[PDB]
Structure formats: C-alpha cells, structure tokens
Design a binder for these strands. Structure first.
Ligand SMILES: [Zn+2]
Lengths: 131, 184, 26, 124, 92, 181
RNA sequence: AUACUUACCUUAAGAUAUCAGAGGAAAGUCCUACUGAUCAAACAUGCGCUUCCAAUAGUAGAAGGACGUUAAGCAUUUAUCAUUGAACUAGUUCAUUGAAGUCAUUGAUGCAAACUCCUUGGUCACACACACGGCGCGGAAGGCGUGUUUGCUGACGUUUCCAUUCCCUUGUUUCAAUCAUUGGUUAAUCCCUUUGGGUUAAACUGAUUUUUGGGGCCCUUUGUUUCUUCUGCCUGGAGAAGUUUGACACCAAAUUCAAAUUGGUGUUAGGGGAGCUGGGGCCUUUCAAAA
C-alpha cells in the first residue's frame, strides 16, 4: 500500500506502463525480458524485494498518480526508506510518494486469509457513486 | 523497344549499343547532363534544413534567472544589403572550392625527376589513363627523357622569386605597416 | 565576382638608414 | 516496433528502410528505392552487417550480445541472385499524407513542364 | 529495369564491386552491359583474404557480381522520379 | 583561416560552439553560455562576433610570423631541391640558409628545428657546412653528444671535403669516451 | 532553331478480373455503360477497435547512432618457403643463392566500463486531483466494417462538350479603457384598442468592430516569418506591388564587354471565414410492404 504522484501518463497500455515503471524501480529485475506478465486475481508477486501488484486507471481524476502495493506494511515502508527521501526519477520526472490513505485491496486478501462483504459494499457504494 | 534519355528528354528509337553509346558520349547530351547534376548538386547546399522546433514551457526558475539578464540587441540588414552579402559569401565559397594550393609543384620545377612525377601525363599510375582520357578532338609538352644535364645552374637570371604569402581581404589592415629592411 | 578573397600583402619601406640596410657590413 | 500493411508488396513499399538477407549470411540495411523483375534492388544509405566466425558460437543454443562487424556503403545495387529474404526495419521520413502532397505537386509540375516545352517548340 | 539503368548512369565514375568469390574490385567503370557484366579501368583489387594488388584493366562476369557501390550523388538522378512527363514518341 | 571563419559562420546553434572549445572556457574567458535559455538568436550573433575577434588576434600573431619568415629568409631561397653532387649553390643562398637556421634555432622548436636542418640539408648536402653546424647545435644547445656523433657519421657520406667533419668527429668520439671506435 | 555533309541504327507476340445465367450475330466464337455472385483498385466513412506520440513542480529523460575518446585499456595468440656450405644433437644456430611477400604487432581476437558528442519526438490541453483498473483535441502506424465509383493507370488530340466563386490574415494570446453596430430584460412618459400592442429617451446583459494601454508566451524567422519582388526592422512584429498559357530565384557557358542571349534546376506557401458541393450519424413529418 503506497501512493505516488506526477508519473508519466503517456504509455496507454497497463502492461507496458507497468513494464516502464517496474523498469525504473529495479533494473535487471525479473521482467526486462517481456514474454509475459503475471495477473493475480482479487482474493504470487510481481518482483522481488517487496513488490506485488500495480494499479493504474485512465480516469481524468487519477491521471498521473499510480499506486503500488507490497507484500507487507514493513516492506512497503522499507521501500520508502530504501531511497530515504532521496527522490528517484521515472521516465522524465522525480516522483513524490507517500503512504496510501486507503489500505491495499490485495493486502486485504492476505490479511483476512491470516471477503464477500467488501465486494458487496463496493458494488453498492459504486452504484451510489454513479448517482 | 525505344531508349528514352531523360536528361535530354529526347527519345532515341530502337536502342542499340552503338547508337546509345554514341548518344551518351555526344557533346550535347554531355552538356545537358553535366548541367543537370550541377543543379541537383547545388540544391543540397541551397536547400535550408528547416528542422522542426519543439518549444517547452519555460520554468519559473529560469524565467527569473533570465529576466535579470539584460536583453541583447539584434542586427538585421536591409533586403538590398543582404542580397549583395549573400552573393559575396557564395562567391567566396566557390573560391575556397577551387583553391587547391600547388606550391610544391612550383618549388621542384627544376628537380632532376620533375618530369617523371609532376607532369602527370608521363607517370606510371596515372600516365596511361590520360591518353584514353584525351578528347576525340574531332576537327579544327615536357617529355620524360629530360636529364639534369639541361639547366645545370638553376639560377642564371631564370627564376622568379617565390610568390608572397596571401592575406585575408577583411583583415588586410592587420599587417604590420612597415617592413624591417629596405627592399629594392 | 569583383573583389577577391585573398590579396598579396603590400608594406611600407623603412626610410633606409644604416640599421635597416640589409647589405650593411661595417 | 513497426507494423507493415497486412497486404503490402515490394512495389507498395518504397523509401522504407529495409533489411536484406543474402545467401552468404550478411545483411544490407537501408532505404529501398527501385527493384526489378528478378528482384535486384537499389538501397540508398546501406550498411552491411556481418556476424564474425568468432561470435557465431555465441548464437548456438544453450541475454546474448553479439558483436556484429558492419561497414557502410552508400547507394548500392544488389543482385537478385544473392538475395534471400527481405524484412522491414523502419518507415519513411514522410507520412502517407505528406507523400500524397508531394506526389500531387510533382505531377502538376511535370504537366507544367510538358506545356512549357510544347509551346516553346511550337511557335519558334 | 531501373537498377541496371543506374549502373549505365555510373559510367566514367569510381565504383566498387563485390564478387561472389569474396574479392573487392574498386576502380573506375568503363563499360557495362544489360547482363551486368562490367569492365573497369585502373582498379585496386582486394583478394578474399585481404591481399591487395593493382591492375590497369579488368572485365568481370555479371553473374559473379554481388553488390556494386555507385557514387552517392546518383541518388537524386532522374531515374527515380515517380511521376514524370514524357513527350510523344516519334513515329517510325 | 577562411575555412575556420566559414565554419564559424555556419554554426546555427549554441550546442555547436562546444565543438570549438569546452563549456568552461567559453563561460570564463569569453563569458558566453551554451545552456543559456531565452531568445537565443541575437545572443548567438553576439557569440559569433566574440569568437571572431580572438580568431582575428590569432590571425594577427601568425600573420606577423609568416610575413617575417617570408620577408627575410624564404623569399631569398630560390632552390628547395637536391640537384646533384656536381651542383654549386650561390653564396647569398648559403648565407640565407645559415641565418635561417640560426633563427630556427632561436625559436627553440625542436621538431621545426630538425626539420629546417633536414630542409636545409638536401639543397646543399655536399659541402660539410650545414653538417658541422647541425652537429654543433645538437652538441651544445640540446647537449646531446651521441646525436652529434651520428650527425657527423651521416655527414661523412654526403660531404665531399670530409676533413673538418672527420676532425670534429675525432673530437666528439674522444669526449664520448669510445676509444675502440 | 533552320539548311547541307558523314556515321550509327530500325516493330518478341498476346492480353487488361473471374464465374454463372438470359439475349443477338447442334458446334464453337464475339458481343450486350444486360442480370446475379465473387475478386481487385480508388475514394469516402465509421467504429467506447490496437499500439505510439519527452522534464520544466525541472538542469532531466526515451529511441537510435559515433565510419568518437579513454586507448600502446585488460586478457590472449601471431610474423615467410626452397637449395648449398660450416658447427651441432642423432632436430638447432650462422652465411650465401632463388621464389612469392595487403598494410598493420600502438596490430588482430576476446572482455567490459566510463565519458563525450550527433539525429529524432504534440517537449499539445486540462489538471496536482486516494483508485479497482477510461470514455479531452489532435498526429503517426495498423486491423476490421459499411457505402459509392471504376474494372490497370496516365499523358496527348477532338466536341452544340460541361466547366465558371470570393473575403480576411502571415507574431500569437489575454485583460482593461473608450467608440461604433445588433439582440434580450426592467422603470418612466405619450398614443390606440385592469390587460395587450407600437414608439421615445434611460438603465442592465451578451455578441461583433475601431483606437490606446497593460500583461503573457515566441521571434533559430539564424538571408528576423521562408509565397515572391522592392522598401525596411530589436527603443520592433511594418509598408508597397504581384500570383500559373505568368512571374521569381539560381546554375552553365562563349562572346560581347555589366543588360540580354541560349540551355537547365527549383519556388509559386500556410491559416481562418462566407458561398457551392460530396459523405456520415441523429431528430421530426409524409408515403409503400410485412406482421
Ligand atoms: Zn541524351
């Protein structure tokens, strides 16, 4: 569960955009190769040293900020003091990141394993946000 | 078939190695084609690159750092002026194209092997080719055998002293005004 | 094609005293 | 990378930078301009790439990095006998619309040439 | 075809050759036919193994030629004009 | 200088001024910036003037040197080539080679010095005149004694008189402490 | 360009989508701006179709190169054959005679990094917005689909052929002041038949235009807006003439002697609006068929 800012919006394909984003974070990671990408279903890891999944929408509200989730909260923070407020830069820009106000959704699948009501609530409050 | 010569734009009927070889060697076709590549060659120097401009949003920092720096004046010549100066510059480039400083050939003129090397008609590598390069000469020397025995004393009122080194026309007022010694 | 890029330098003569005389021996 | 038109023949593609394979295992990359009945073609700015005998053992089955010795030779004319297969590398400096524009202007200029020649021949 | 016509347009200019035997003949092109067999003048030869020699005149078979390198300024030569306007052919 | 001035004239961008000299010397000595961001055109036109001035100065110095070297020496030298062992050279030409060699020695440029000895050596190789001097400047100025021995040895071949060269050569070998030679 | 002389030489063949049905001149052929099916090209036009299109909230970054440097980098392996004589172990060194002999050994092969420099892109608009993985305007490249036209395509010639336009602008954008024009709302007065209509002057609001001022960004447009020519410009963004059987620029010559002559290459551009015209989606009305 972690939150970013001012990322590149321009790549339009989520699996290519996670390629670029993952490429800037960890050079010589699992995936510089591009046969395939993993897709964990709601309720496996993307990259070693804490990374699990990546989430990006196309909405004008969420445009530039893409969110990352991690295996556990202490590794989620461990990624943050990896750089220790020394700004990394993705394609063109230094990113300003912080802790997500909402808990990681796939982290809730791990927490409660240690979830149908949440999926009902999401359909309901989504139906109301449509209104 | 028919051979269309697109340089001359004139057709020649029923192409044959003889007639086509005669046309290609022809004087008129020669002038036309040579002039054609003269134009197509002058164009790449004439054509302006006109590369595309990509303008980004100037940042708040460099607008403030560049605002304190005073604005420089620009000079723009009149149309009548710039036409003339472009003519002059182009004619100067054409001059630097044809310069090819040969002074070494002027230095060795009286050397014993001058006839075998710098005459270039009687050489070995380039010698035999010049003969076939001679024009058909339709209508209307320095032999190699020379020895040192001719012109035994290179100076008997024969030679001209070496030509002075040239100078730029622009900076010609840079020259030291007076010589150190009295020449005649 | 009137003016040319290069010229031969022309230069003034230094009054011919016994110090600028290239033939002086004594 | 680059998507070639699903139906595009050697005539449809001009000025595209190509990649040409010969029988000897060397490649000529460059802009195609003309070609012929027996498929000997003319490349504009082309560079022949070669895998040395010493690097070749690196390609046999086990990230590989091959040192490919290449030399630049401009405006060549290949021979159809040597050519093996052809692949597309890039797309031309100009878009399709722009090439339509220059084609139309070139044709109009060509007609103007025929008129200026005809009426220069007729009266004198 | 245009590829051979460009070789005819290269007469009297320095060209390079690659024979399928592996050699390299660089020198001035005197003659060329539609069978692509050319003859060159005052040419420098590179054997397949690199030994370089010099010969005054050479004739090569077109079937053995692999590629020919032609002076670059022939790229814009009129053969490559796509839309071109020819006059009417003379009646014979 | 015409090629240099032209190539300065054809520079269309600030980035191409780093080809002349590095980024630091331009901002320090001439105080011009390549990273300068703003309306560049008049700034680059100022930069071409500031770059052409110093080239005009280099033109001042090098012109001075060339005009001196020609006006004194090179204009007096009518024969730059070897001819034969039976050739004679004029006395004024000898004198101008001698003084041209003293001047070249004064410049203290070793490459151009050895060059101007070998340049002076082929016009007159047979006298022993320039052989002795070219052994002297190298035995004293440079203080190289073996090089002097080797000069006198190569001088034994070309020079016809050989007596002065072989005397000075006896001396050089004595001081070099080679007695068997 | 014209006339004369001399030399070199002359027509591979055929065809222009296929299949099927009906008709005209038992077999076959030809033909039907005839009818259907399929195919192909061009032109339009659509798809919540697919991919891509760079930082200014900063001194960056992506793709591709160097036929660039460090760099004699580090680690390896290489430098002719034959004949005769002397010595020599039982192959080695030296001298002489002959043959050919890419250069390189600072090379060549392998290994890796750092640095520097070149070309390219919408460096667009809106946004700094706690989500479960969209439905901003364009450009590039594709895939799929419908519709029209045509049946390879283009010059040339002929015709009761048919055709047949304009305006503004060439830094841009924004705000403010004032001027002018048009439209809507409210209050008052007058006239006609408490209500309705018209006119008047006045007030508010929107749109368009003229003059000035302020601000923003751009001026590499480098021959200071590149559609020409002429005038001209940084305390400025301007003015005049002109736009395809024409004009302009430039290259080449030999003479005359600075114009022209003849032969060639290239430019004649971009943006907006009005008109006219083609295509697509949507809505309303009218009609025909079917349930
Ligand atoms: Zn011709």
């Amino acid at each position: 569960a972690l939150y970013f800012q001012n990322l590149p919006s321009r790549p339009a394909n989520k699996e290519n955009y996670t390629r670029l984003l993952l490429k800037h974070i960890n050079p010589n990671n699992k995936y510089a190769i591009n046969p395939s990408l993993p897709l964990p279903h709601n309720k496996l890891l993307d990259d070693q040293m804490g990374l699990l999944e990546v989430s990006i929408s196309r909405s004008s509200k969420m445009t530039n900020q893409a969110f990352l989730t991690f295996v556990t909260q202490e590794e989620a923070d461990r990624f943050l003091e990896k750089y220790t407020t020394t700004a990394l830069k993705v394609q063109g820009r230094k990113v300003r990141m912080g802790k997500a106000r909402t808990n990681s959704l796939l982290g809730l699948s791990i927490e409660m394993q240690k979830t149908y009501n949440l999926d009902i609530k999401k359909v309901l409050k989504a139906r109301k946000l449509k209104r | 078939t028919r051979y269309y010569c697109e340089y001359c734009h004139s057709y020649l009927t029923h192409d044959t190695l003889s007639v086509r070889k005669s046309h290609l060697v022809g004087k008129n076709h020669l002038r036309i084609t040579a002039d054609y590549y003269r134009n197509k060659a002058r164009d790449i120097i004439n054509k302006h690159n006109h590369k595309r401009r990509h303008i980004g949003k100037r940042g708040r920092k460099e607008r403030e750092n560049s605002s304190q720096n005073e604005t420089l004046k620009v000079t723009c010549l009149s149309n009548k002026e710039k036409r003339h100066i472009m003519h002059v510059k182009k004619m100067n480039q054409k001059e630097l194209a044809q310069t090819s400083i040969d002074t070494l050939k002027l230095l060795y003129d009286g050397s014993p092997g001058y006839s075998k090397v710098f005459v270039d008609a009687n050489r070995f590598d380039i010698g035999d080719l010049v003969k076939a390069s001679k024009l058909p000469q339709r209508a209307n020397s320095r032999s190699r055998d020379e020895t040192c025995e001719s012109n035994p004393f290179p100076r008997l009122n024969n030679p001209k002293k070496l030509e002075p080194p040239k100078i730029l026309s622009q900076w010609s007022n840079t020259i030291p005004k007076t010589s150190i010694f009295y020449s005649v | 094609n009137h003016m040319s890029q290069f010229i031969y330098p022309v230069q003034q003569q230094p009054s011919l005293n016994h110090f600028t005389d290239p033939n002086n021996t004594t | 990378k680059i998507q070639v038109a699903h139906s595009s023949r050697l005539a449809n593609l001009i000025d595209y930078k190509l990649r040409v394979l010969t029988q000897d295992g060397r490649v000529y990359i460059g802009q195609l301009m003309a070609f012929d009945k027996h498929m000997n073609l003319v490349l504009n700015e082309c560079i022949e790439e070669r895998v040395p005998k010493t690097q070749l053992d690196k390609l046999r089955p086990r990230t590989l990095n091959i040192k490919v010795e290449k030399r630049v030779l401009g405006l060549t004319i290949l021979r159809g006998e040597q050519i093996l297969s052809t692949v597309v590398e890039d797309k031309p400096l100009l878009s399709k619309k722009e090439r339509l524009v220059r084609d139309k202007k070139e044709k109009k200029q060509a007609q103007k040439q025929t008129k200026l020649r005809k009426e220069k021949e007729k009266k004198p | 075809g245009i590829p051979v016509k460009l070789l005819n347009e290269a007469q009297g200019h320095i060209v390079s050759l690659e024979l399928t035997t592996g050699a390299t003949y660089r020198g001035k092109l005197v003659e060329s036919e539609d069978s692509m067999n050319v003859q060159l003048r005052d040419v420098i030869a590179t054997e397949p193994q690199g030994a370089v020699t010099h010969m005054d005149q050479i004739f090569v078979r077109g079937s053995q030629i692999k590629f020919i390198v032609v002076p670059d300024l022939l790229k814009n030569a009129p053969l490559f004009k796509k839309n071109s306007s020819r006059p009417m052919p003379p009646i014979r | 200088y015409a090629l240099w001035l032209q190539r300065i004239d054809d520079i269309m961008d600030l980035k191409q001024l780093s080809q002349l000299t590095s980024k630091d010397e331009l901002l320090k000595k001439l105080k011009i910036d390549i990273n300068y961001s703003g309306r560049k055109g008049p700034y680059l036109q100022d930069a071409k003037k500031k770059l052409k001035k110093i080239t005009k100065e280099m033109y001042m110095v090098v012109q001075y040197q060339v005009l001196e070297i020609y006006s004194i020496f090179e204009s007096k030298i009518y024969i730059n080539y070897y001819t034969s062992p039976e050739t004679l050279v004029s006395s004024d030409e000898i004198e101008t080679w001698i003084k041209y060699l003293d001047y070249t020695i004064t410049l203290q440029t070793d490459s151009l010095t050895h060059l101007n000895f070998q340049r002076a050596l082929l016009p007159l190789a047979h006298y022993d005149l320039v052989w002795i001097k070219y052994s002297k400047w190298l035995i004293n100025s440079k203080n190289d004694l073996l090089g002097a021995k080797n000069v006198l040895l190569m001088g034994l071949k070309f020079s016809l008189k050989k007596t002065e060269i072989i005397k000075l050569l006896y001396s050089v070998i004595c001081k070099l402490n080679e007695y068997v030679l």
